[PDB]
Structure formats: C-alpha cells, structure tokens
Amino acid sequence: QNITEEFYQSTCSAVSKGYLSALRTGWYTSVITIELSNIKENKCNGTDAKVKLIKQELDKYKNAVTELQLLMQSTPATNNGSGSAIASGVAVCKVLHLEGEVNKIKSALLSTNKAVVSLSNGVSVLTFKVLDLKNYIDKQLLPILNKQSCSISNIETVIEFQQKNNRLLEITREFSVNAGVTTPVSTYMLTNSELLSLINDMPITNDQKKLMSNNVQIVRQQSYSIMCIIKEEVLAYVVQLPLYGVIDTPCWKLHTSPLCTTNTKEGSNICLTRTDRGWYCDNAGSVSFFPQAETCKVQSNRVFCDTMNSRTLPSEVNLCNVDIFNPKYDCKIMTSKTDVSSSVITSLGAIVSCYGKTKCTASNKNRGIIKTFSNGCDYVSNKGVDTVSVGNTLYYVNKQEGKSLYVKGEPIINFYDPLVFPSDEFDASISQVNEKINQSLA
Amino acid sequence: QNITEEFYQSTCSAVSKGYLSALRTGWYTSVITIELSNIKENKCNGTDAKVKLIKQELDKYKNAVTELQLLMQSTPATNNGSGSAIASGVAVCKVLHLEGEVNKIKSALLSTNKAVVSLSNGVSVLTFKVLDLKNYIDKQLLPILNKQSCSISNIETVIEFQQKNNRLLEITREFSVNAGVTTPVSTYMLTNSELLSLINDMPITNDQKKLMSNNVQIVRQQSYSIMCIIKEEVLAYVVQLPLYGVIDTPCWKLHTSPLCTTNTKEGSNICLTRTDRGWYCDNAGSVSFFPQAETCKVQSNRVFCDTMNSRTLPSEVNLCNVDIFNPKYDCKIMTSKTDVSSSVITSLGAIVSCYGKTKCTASNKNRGIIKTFSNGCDYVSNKGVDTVSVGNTLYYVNKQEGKSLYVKGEPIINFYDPLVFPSDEFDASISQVNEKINQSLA
Amino acid sequence: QNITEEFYQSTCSAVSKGYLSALRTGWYTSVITIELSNIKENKCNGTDAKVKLIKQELDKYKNAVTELQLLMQSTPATNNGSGSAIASGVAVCKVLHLEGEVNKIKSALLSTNKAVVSLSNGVSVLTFKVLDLKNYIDKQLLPILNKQSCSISNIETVIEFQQKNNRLLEITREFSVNAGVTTPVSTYMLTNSELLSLINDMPITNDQKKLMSNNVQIVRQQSYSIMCIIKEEVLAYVVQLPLYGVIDTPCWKLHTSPLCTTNTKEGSNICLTRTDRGWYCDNAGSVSFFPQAETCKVQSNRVFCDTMNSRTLPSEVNLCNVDIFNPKYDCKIMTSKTDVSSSVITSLGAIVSCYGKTKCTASNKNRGIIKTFSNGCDYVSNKGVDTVSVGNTLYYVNKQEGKSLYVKGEPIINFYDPLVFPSDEFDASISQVNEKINQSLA
Ligand SMILES: *[C@@H]1O[C@H](CO)[C@@H](O)[C@H](O)[C@H]1NC(C)=O
Ligand SMILES: *[C@@H]1O[C@H](CO)[C@@H](O)[C@H](O)[C@H]1NC(C)=O
Ligand SMILES: *[C@@H]1O[C@H](CO)[C@@H](O)[C@H](O)[C@H]1NC(C)=O
Fold it and tell me: Between which residues do disulfide bridges form (chains A, B, C)?
C-alpha cells in the first residue's frame, strides 16, 4: 500500500516502487449456451396487428441466427487466429465442431442449466445455459402459429417475447461488428451474477477468487468472448477468462526523459535518454518487463499485466536505477541532438526537461507559480504542486500520496566530449557508446 | 478561408497555409445527475403477466445499478488515472466522495432540475438532472408493489417504465465496456438539447459560444464522460468539455516525402527526408507542433487540436520551409538508402517520390493519364487531376480548391558526396550531417 | 489449399507459402435512402397515456434527425476527408448536395424501393430504400394528431411505431459517435439480405460475386458507411464496398527474428535482423508488400489486403529468402546489441531466439517438454508441439496443418568481425553494411 518514488538526477529518470503484481499466466475457457428452437418457415393466412408484431419480432430471431451463421463461416472460428491470445478458446471452439459434443453439453444442461462437462479433448469446461429461448418459443409461440389460422391472443405475449429475444439480438450485434471476438466481455455476453458465479466455481484457490471478485471490471477488460457454432438448437460461445499465476510480487515503473547539455542554441548540445521505460515486475527469479503501456492496468496499488506482451530480463536489470555504469548489466540508452523541452508525469511527481528559451514552471492552484525550472532535467513532487507547464503545454500532476526521494547526482551527459560523442544512436548502450568513443579516439 | 500550398522541390516537402486555429488549453467540468430510488427487495405473491413484465424490467434497473457500483470500485474513479486528460474531471469526481457534497447537489436540483453549485473545493460547477427516475418509480410503481398483493394495472405503465429506464440502461452499458470513461460523449450521456444548453451557460465569451455551438460534433469527439458515484439515491457522472483558449491564429501542415538521388539500381543512391511533419500553429509567441495526426481534427478551414500532445517550438522553425540550411534553426532530417516509390496526398495536391523502375502517373477521370512522373520527387496540384498511381497503389487527390505554388529549386541531395554521406541517420539534422562529413574528410 | 513453410537458419527468418490473394483495388458506391416525413410541431390539448407514449417516441424521431443534421454540418461530408479511403464515397456524397439529385433518387424509388440511378456526375449508382417511414407516419400517425384533439387508439400502433423507428435510431447513434463514418458496416446500416442483394446486382463478374458472398463478414469489415444529407424528406447515406481486382495470385508472409552471436554476457555479442516482415503478394508483374498486419485479413488460405497501405517492390525482392547476399536486390537488415530472448509464432511453427541465461523450451500438452532450445535462433514445426515458452512468456503454436522445411545454413552473423561491425543500424542493408566495414578497415 506504501507508494514511494526515487528520482535519479544523474540519469534523468525516476522509478515508482511499492506496487503489487497480478500477472496473467493462463486462461480459463467456459462455454456459454443459449437454447434455441429450429423452426419451419410458418406463415399465417391473415394479417392481424397482434400477429404482425410477432411476425416482425420473429424476423429478428431469424436474422440474428443467419448473421451468427455467417460469423461461424469466417475467422477466427476456422483456420486463422491460433497464434494469438484466443488460442485456448479456439481449441474448445474447434472441439464443439465434433459430434456429439453439442449433444454432450445439451444433455448436461436440461436439468440444471449450469454444469461442468468433460469434452473428448480432455478439458473440464464449465457450461452455462443463460437463456432457454426454445422452451419459451415452443410453449407459447409455436402452437399459436401451427393452426393454419393464428390466434388473436393478448399482446403481453409480444412484449414478453421481445424481452427474451433482446439479449440474443445484442450478442449477435456485438459479434457482427467485432468479427466474432469481443473484448471487454460485455454484460450481455456474461452478466455480473453469471460472471461472479463463474469465478466462484473455477479450479482456483480461495485467494484468487477474492482477487478476481474484487476486480470484476478488470477481469472483464482482460477477457475474450468467442463465437463458435449454431448446431442442433444450441448457440454456444466461449468466454476466455484470465488466470493470474503471479500475485503479490513487487513491481515498479521506470520513467525516463531526455538529458541534454545546457546551452542555449541555436547550437550543438548533445543528449542521451534511458530506454526500455515501462513496468517491471519480479517473476520466477527473473524480471518481467512490459514496454507497452496498454498491457498493464493499475488498480489501487496492484498492477494487472499480460505476460504475452512481456520480455524476460535478468534481475540485474534493476542496476540501471542505482548505477548506470555497472558491468553486470549493459544498460541501454539512445542519443540525439533534439534539445526540445518536455515533461513526464510520474506517479508521485513530474520530471521536467527544460532546454532552450522555453518557459517551464510548476504552479499551485491557489498560490500560483512556485517553481521555475532552469535549463536541464529536474523533478518536483506532487506535494503542494497541482500543474506543470512546459511552453504552451499544461500537465496535471497525479495527486496520489507517497513519499518522494530526490537522488542528487551529476548528469552523466557532462562526462562525454561532444566532439567525439555519437549523437544519433537509435538503440545503443553504455558499453556500446564508450567503445564507439575509443575507436574515434585513434 | 483562403487555402494555399507551397511545394519545395529542393527539400521534397510541402506546406498547406491558410488555416485557423482552435487549440484546447483548458477543461470545463459539469456534473450530470440521475435521480434514483432506493428500493427494498419487494416481492409479490402471485405471478401475473402484467406484473411479471414489471418484475423483469425492474431487474434491469437493479442490475444496472450493481454494474455501475462495480465501475465505482475500479479506476479511474479511485487512485490511478490522474496524470492523464481526465485529471480535471477526476478532481470533481473525488470531491463528490465527500459529504455532504451529494446532498448539496441534490438540494439544488429538486426545484429547477438544472443549477450551478459551489463545491467544498471551490469550483463553480453546473449540475444537471436529466432524469428523475425516483419521482416516477415512487409515484406509480412503489405503491402497487407495497400491497403484499400487487395490482393488475394497465400495461401502459410497463411501456412508460421501459422508456424512462432506457436511457439509464444505455449509460450503464457504455460505461461497463469503457472502464467508466467514454469518448466521444454519446447523445445518451448528454443530448443535443442538453449539450447546447450547457454551452450557452458556460463562463466563456460570446465568441467561444458560437464556435462550440457551430461545431457540436467536434466538441463531442473531444469531450469525456466519467462515472463517479451512486450515493444517496443520486447517480452522478462528470462530463469534461474542452475550452479553446487559442482561436484564429494561423496554422499550417507540413508534408514530407523521401528525396533520393536518381539512378536505377540495383545500386547505391543516397536519400534524405525532412522530419517532424504534422500540424504547426502559432501560440503565444512560439509555435505549437502536433506530430500525431490523431490529435488535430480539421473542420472547414479551422484546425481543432489538443495542446496536451504538442511540443513548443521557437518561431524560427518555419525557416526550414524557406531555407533548410539556415543557422538560426537546426532543421532535422533522416537518411536512408531505401529507394522505394511512394506518394503523399497533401491538401491541394500530391507529392510523388518515384524511384527505380516504378510506374508513377497522375490520371484524370475522363481524360486518362495526364502526367508521367520521372525519377525524383515531383508535385502536382489537384487542378484537373483526380487520381495518382504509384506502382500498384492508387491515391485519390483531395478536391478542395486552393491556389498552389511550385517553388523550383535544386534537390539538396545532389549537394552531398555519396562516398562520405551518412546513409542511416534515424533522427539527425543538417548541422549534424555536415559535421559528420567533416570528421570523415580527415 | 496447400500451406507450406520454409525456415532459413542462415537469416533467422521464415516464409509461409501457399496462400491466395484477394487485394482490394477499387471501391463501389451505393446510396441507401430512408423515406422520412417532414412534420409541423403539432401538439395535442390533452395528456393521454396512449398519446403520451407517441409523444415520447416521436421526440426520438425528432432528435435523431437533429443529430444527423449536426453530422451533416461536420466532416467528412464537407471539406476535409478527401485524401483518405472514403474519397469515392465523399464524391457521391457531394453530388447529392446538388439539385435535383435528391429528387432524382426519390422518384426512382417510389415504385420499386430499389433501383439504379445515373447522377449528374456520370456514375451509375445503385439506390436502396430500406425504410419507408414517411408512408407509415402519414397514414397512421399524422391524421390522429391533426384533429386538434387526438384519438385514444389502440396501443398496438405505439409498438408498431417503435419497431419502424428502431432502425433509424440505431443508425443515428452509430453515426453520432463515429463522426458520420462507421467501419465495419453494421447490420443496421445494411442487413444481410440487403448486402447480399447488393452484391448480386453489382457490375462484376460471376466469380467475384461468389467470392464476396462467401465472405460477407470480411466484406463488412472492409466497407465504409458515410452519412450525407437530410434533404426533402429523404435520408441518404453512402455504403462503400470493396472491389477485389487481384484474385488468386500467390501470397506469402515473411517472419523475422533477431540473429545474434552466441555468448553468455554480460558482454558484447552483435546482432542483425531482417526487416520488412509482413505479407507479400504478386501483383501485375511486381510484388505488393504490406508491412502493417492490420491491413491484411486471412480467411482460410486466402489473404484479403488493401492496396492503399502497400508498397510496390520488384519481383527480385523474393531473393532475400533464397540468398540474402544477392546483388540483384539490396536486402535490408537492422543491427543492435540487444541479446534479449523472444519467439515468433509463424503459420506452421515457431521461431525461437534464445540468448543469455533464458530458459526456452517447446512443450507438449500431455507429454511435457520435448525440445530445449540452445543459444541461437532455432525453429520447430507445429507437429506434436502445442506451446513454446521463452523465459516467463508462454506462446501457443498455430495448429493448422502444413508441411515444414528446415533450410540448414550457417548464421550470417558469424561472417562479420565484431570489432568492426556496426551494431546500431536502424534501417541498413547488406551492401550498406559491407561498405561501412570497408571504410573502417582503412
Ligand atoms: C508505510 O506506510 C505507513 C503508514 O501506515 C508509515 O507509517 C510507514 O512509515 C511507511 N513506510 C515507509 C514509507 O517506508
Ligand atoms: C483570397 O480569396 C479571394 C476570394 O474571394 C480572392 O479574391 C483572393 O485573390 C485570394 N487571395 C489570395 C489567394 O492571396
Ligand atoms: C498438396 O496437398 C495434397 C493433398 O491432397 C498432397 O497430396 C500433395 O502432396 C501436396 N503437395 C505438396 C505439399 O507439394
């Protein structure tokens, strides 16, 4: 719960410590079924207002099935889509193409509406029947059609049919514009009462059940819904839920900013920037790194990340935060001559890289300007500061409370000779730059 | 309203002038409230068709509140989400967690349904009550439930309840699949009559009211809707509207394209390309630059950009369009050996970089091919041209009318010696390349 | 239908052959019309429950038109949006601003509801009237309003009006939050029965009709819906369909992975990686290349790509797969010192780049670990393998069946001297690296 932050003046970088991990290492597949009714193209002789409304609402049921059958003919239910994140779901999606797998799940749900199943591929899958639309249609709609003259029943049956058919039409619509795969999983795909009941019945520890139940919105955002088949009066689609195998290991986020020589110009000042910024978490003796910010979602002091878009780095990678010149790890930097001003809003403050004739200030909402940044790379904590201005750009500082630490140190950009410094390294390293200088010093 | 364009043959770049600015420099927060009714889990003894429909439609009201309460437990309403664009909205979202802030806005809306409020944090916020669902439920639905036997009233009350509850269910659905933050702000979050009435009552000049009212769709696309609380029979969510503090200052868009030596090969021809293409606008003595094309939205001759994703550059940056070798500003270029053909559709024409054995032509819809591009970097105005073909790729030229200017000049790629030219500079500059040549000339 | 794959050990790259092309080279524009009724602000004297529901449902019709008129005032219907993919649609969208173009399409649809038209710009466009809402309103809703006292008719007219108005409200909502351009084209914009009937009546060969009809979901994902006008009781919007002019030409996908020297360190090992990975297809004597993976969609063994985001390359570009040192084409590589482990899931297997102390294995679901990768770049086919682990990251192998070919060869990284190797080339080439070595060897 304690959040702390350290700013390294020598490297123009900051690290936000104190977070807890929640890394997804596996998937859990569950089949959601909707009992449907196969109908003949029945038609009535007369055009009655109470019957024409049923005629129109039945067409929505007929068109939604036709649309889902078109989604069944296209990816990812067939062929492409196996080397991605929905691989575990497609495996179950492909099993249901076998017979009588649809009969195996239909027979286990006619008595409870919700049960476990064992498929022929040997995966114990929880099956849900969230809508028994066949039971409703065959009991109150099919006999009235069948007469060859249809009844003029009360119109409340028409409204009851729209409510039963409403959830089916939304699922079809969500699948139709998302190529049969939706994420996050909407409440129409799986309601809150169904998702919570699904979490409580998963082969997981009691600790992981509380974790997922207290962050159901995060679970939805990291889940997938995959359309499968319409076979034998059963509409089945797989919901792929995340399994967090790494919990409560320490995480930290690295913030970087350009570090340049301070001159005003109109001239030549060299720069360097630490690379590989993002989220780092300890994971099985190594360190998992997440470069893309879209993969990690921060809730309170816990970080939910997906290990599919991660890189495994040795634990010595944390040495770049304490000593960038260490030999145990080759810390990576990029170089340039772009002396443009910018600011990075960290967790407990803001890094400000002010260069040229740019006006960089940190202001208070009531008090006004409380700090004017000189040329270079500086830092200010959120304590008492509300906004940071860099030129014509305004940044709002994160207000979450934590203790900050300003680690004083000489900027490492002053250790290099500009006449020999490689000022255009896209993805270099400290040892790569120092040896590139030794060659030019001949 | 006049749009002009200049093509610089020396640098293989173009500039589209004549635009007006509309840069967002601030946010305006307003609270939208929905009066709700806290209910007991009341149940009836009998199952009546006219009552069961109310039973089902009431469950949607009960599930939508439960879903929004789950969104209230997750970000950005708590902790994370303060260093982003919704910072001003989260500040008001956090204030409503205090008491009796919910009672302060509920008391000011029972008489008008729409009023200003002064929160404890000292921000004058406009509050709207767009739906008084409590008044409807407690007057026509609660007494019928309460009997311990429920009435068989007319079914028009059921349809009236679905219309009142329809807007609440859509807001919950839009929030549930967007982590409680939606953009653009949909008409269900804020209708056209409500948004226009909101713009007319904002502390802004009469000039800015006409600007926002004549571009309400652009305002929606640059606005945010943030879910906050469900506390004491009131559902409150903040709508964050943009404030354009820079209006009618001149803007221009820089288009670039690779400039290579003309040889056919199968061989070694060097190339260079101007960097930092995008939108430039004058802003407070400096120039705001917008590299990402997603930040600026062009409507008629006015450019709507967000200064959060901008860089403040000195006014001398425009010298790269008139003299790329000027000493007052270090113009940036990148180099490569990739002699691949490409085309850039500008505002009033198209830049064509034709290299190798590629067939580059500009055609007319009725006439046919009217220009065959030779090897090099050329330009053609939209006057009489409808399409541009580069190899197997077809580009459609923008048809908007403007005067074009072809600035003849020797391509600067011919000034360099290929045997000494650095042909792999990711992000270099003119002075950085000329000094990199002086070192190799030893 | 045959899918094969070749892995080149010398270049740490793979190619997936056997695919068929479906490249989009043109657009087809069609106008979809909705007959509307212009009304006066009629009001009734009494507040009747059967009439108030019509009062409320009519407000949705009045607000949806006002919202679409606001979308008509903004882009892309006016000015900006011509240099993009919707250029062909905007051309027809602009023609309908002329008179009496709206009268020309309204007169051709009062008798069939579906017909071809010839606009003044000379484009034969198919026009559809998918909803005659004017006929319904003026026949059953206007006379009841007109009385100055409105009738207490049966409430089934209210439900029939919500069904007729439902499709109009969804189109307005989809346009309002997408700036008047939606993609994919939803079923509400164009139903399956309407889209199939549209494909059958297009000026295309019988071969292209079967191709589009068997992949209607892919056609929807590559189509655009553009809002145009609300003029003279007619709501018109253009649906832009793709035209595939390149069919059944061979395609292949290039997969690359870093190739480094094998040392454990903590030290200096040089690396190189083949660039320009993605989809390649033969197209008119040349080769179309698609770098972005979002442009190509793979269905079965056919690849649907958009030539707008492609590059035309000579046919000799395939020589980098058989001989990277060939002089006929200058193959491009990038260099670095980043010895981080990673894996690339190909079509019929997986490339594994294992470096350092990283644990890289390929496992079977039932059997367990079946291959332990040594340091270097290796490959394994999907035959018998289900997952691949690289450090703390788990990859699922594509299970589609094909024959794989392991092309043995010495890694080309061993041919270079590390003391003279340029280890930071962002976008270089083989001939560019060998000449960069000749300069340093002086
Ligand atoms: C952690 O937080 C607690 C607050 O209960 C505080 O007392 C303690 O000093 C903190 N420890 C740190 C910041 O190291
Ligand atoms: C600006 O546009 C007007 C059109 O009213 C034209 O007369 C004038 O010459 C234009 N000025 C330019 C292009 O500098
Ligand atoms: C192509 O597939 C057929 C399967 O019918 C097979 O018999 C043939 O050997 C394959 N040809 C190849 C892989 O070259």
Answer: 12-377, 44-150, 251-281, 260-271, 296-305, 320-331, 354-360
Angle at Cα B428 formed by Cα B426 and Cα B430, nearest 5°? 145
Window 285-314 of B: residues touching C by CB (8 A cutoff) are 297-301
CA-wise closest residue to A11 among A258, A359, A249: A258
Cα–Cα distance, B387 to B350 (Å, whole number): 9
Q: Does B176 touch chain A (CB under 8 A)?
A: yes
In a domain, A330, yes or no: yes
Q: Does one domain contain both A105 and A215? A: yes
d(CA A308, CA C121): 52
A33 with A259: CB under 8 angstroms? no
Resolution value in angstroms: 3.0
What's the token pair of residue B21?
């600015």
CATH code: domain of residue C211:
1.10.287
Sign of CA dihedral B72, B75, B76, B80: positive
Distance between CA atoms of residues A437 and C324, nearest Å: 31
Contacts of C221 in chain A (CB under 8 A): 179
Which of A300, A358, A396 has the CB atom closest to B88's CB atom?
Answer: A396
What phi and psi, each to the nearest 5 degrees, are found at residue A407?
A: -90, 100
Q: Do C206 and C226 have their domain in common?
A: yes
Cα of B280 vs centre of ligand 2, distance in Å, is 22
Smallest Cα–Cα separation from A190: which of A176, A170, A210? A170
The DSSP symbol for A426 reads S
Contact status of B431 with chain C (Cβ, < 8 Å): no
The count of domains in chain B is: 2
Residue B185 CA to residue B225 CA, distance in Å, equals 6
- List the structure tokens of B228: 């906050």
Closest CA to B349 of B313, B402, B304, B390: B402
CA distance B137 to B34: 13
Q: Residue B32: which domain range?
A: 23-246
Closest residue by Cα to residue C386 from A287, A311, A121, A100: A121
In a domain, A297, yes or no: no
Q: Do B391 and C312 touch (CB under 8 A)?
A: yes
Tell whether A29 lies on the interface with C, counting CB pairs under 8 A: no
The dihedrals phi and psi of B48, each to the nearest 5 degrees, come to: -105, 140
The distance of Cα A75 from the centroid of its chain, to the nearest Å, equals: 22
How far apart are the two ends of chain C, measured CA to CA in Å?
A: 54
> For A321, left (φ over 0), alpha (ψ -120 to 50), or beta?
alpha
Residues C254, C242 within the same domain: no
A204 domain-assigned: yes
Residue B402: closest C-alpha in chain C: C79
Query: Which technique?
Result: X-ray
Q: Is A70 contained in some domain?
A: yes
Distance C70 CA to ligand 2 centre (A): 29
Give yes or no: residues B192 and B296 share one domain: no
| Domain termination site, one of C246, C272, C297 | C246
How far apart are alpha carbons C423 and C437 in whole angstroms? Answer: 11
Nearest residue, CB atoms, A431 vs list C268, C357, C398: C268
Q: Are residues B271 and B153 in the same domain?
A: no
Do A265 and A319 fall within a single domain? yes
Residue B234 shares a structural domain with residue B293: no
Picking from C196, C219, C246, the residue at the C-terminal end of a domain is: C246
Which residues precede gaps in chain C, with C-N > 2.5 A? Answer: none
One domain, residues C141 and C266: no
